[PDB]
Amino acid sequence: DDTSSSINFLTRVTGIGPSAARKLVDEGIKTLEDLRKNEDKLNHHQRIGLKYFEDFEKRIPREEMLQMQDIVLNEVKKLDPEYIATVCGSFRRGAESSGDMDVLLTHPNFTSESSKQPKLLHRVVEQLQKVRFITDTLSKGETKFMGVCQLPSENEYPHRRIDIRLIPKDQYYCGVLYFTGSDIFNKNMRAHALEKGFTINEYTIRPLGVTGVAGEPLPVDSEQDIFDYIQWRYREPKDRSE
């Protein structure tokens, strides 16, 4: 009803999951002004999403992505030019507008064998904060950061959603591929690989076998490699709609 209508609303709130939404409905919380009057029952993630509720409903136009992407690439490079960072999302595909920003990061010192290097990701976050680009943090893991950013004002820009993920170097390309999309694309590509005797996921490419349940990840130094393995002409992100 006009009240379910209320669960529908809350849930627009980043951080506000159903279960999560439901309870707040049981507390008498339904509108947003409700929410603001009740910051104390929301977690850190939900507060922030509440705080930028509107801004978050706004799309990001390419022009801004471009600048955002430059700020990020640039800071990273100063920290250690050995780091590799790529912005995925339809944006990499050439998209005219975006909803948020996705940066996949990596570094040769961090391979799927190490597994334990928070500092590599935190140091970038720190730098991005110290430069005034990232303005807030929703949550921050050892391998993933989710927060808020804003383009520097000269005089203002809405706050945007930014995610930065640290992936091991030996699995970075499957990830970039993976997060670049599109969805169909991945699908048709995974389908084909199979016909070629390979199984791909967001982390590896592995040859099949008898009965099927087979494996052992093939070395991948670029996105190009995955296309070679299945012997398909390379496809520039822009041609990845399907």
Positions at the binding site: 11, 13, 16, 59, 90, 93, 99-100, 102, 163
Q: Classify the C-alpha dihedral 53-55-59-62 as positive or negative.
A: negative
Cα(52)–Cα(54) distance, integer angstroms: 6
Kindly report each contact of residues 144-152 with a partner whose C-beta sits within 8 Å and lies 24 or more positions away, as own/partner: 145/121, 148/48, 148/52, 149/68, 149/101, 151/64, 151/67, 151/68, 151/71
> What tokens does 157 get?
């820009």
Q: What is the DSSP string of 20-42?
A: HHHHHHHTT--SHHHHHHTGGGS
The answer to whether 238 touches 93, Cβ cutoff 8 Å, is yes
C-alpha 138/C-alpha 92 separation (Å) is: 24
In whole angstroms, what is the distance from residue 202 CA to residue 65 CA?
24
- Bridging pattern class, strands 101-106 and 160-166: parallel
Annotated binding residues for Na(+), written as ranges, equal 11, 13, 16
User: Binding site for K(+): which residues?
Assistant: 11, 13, 16
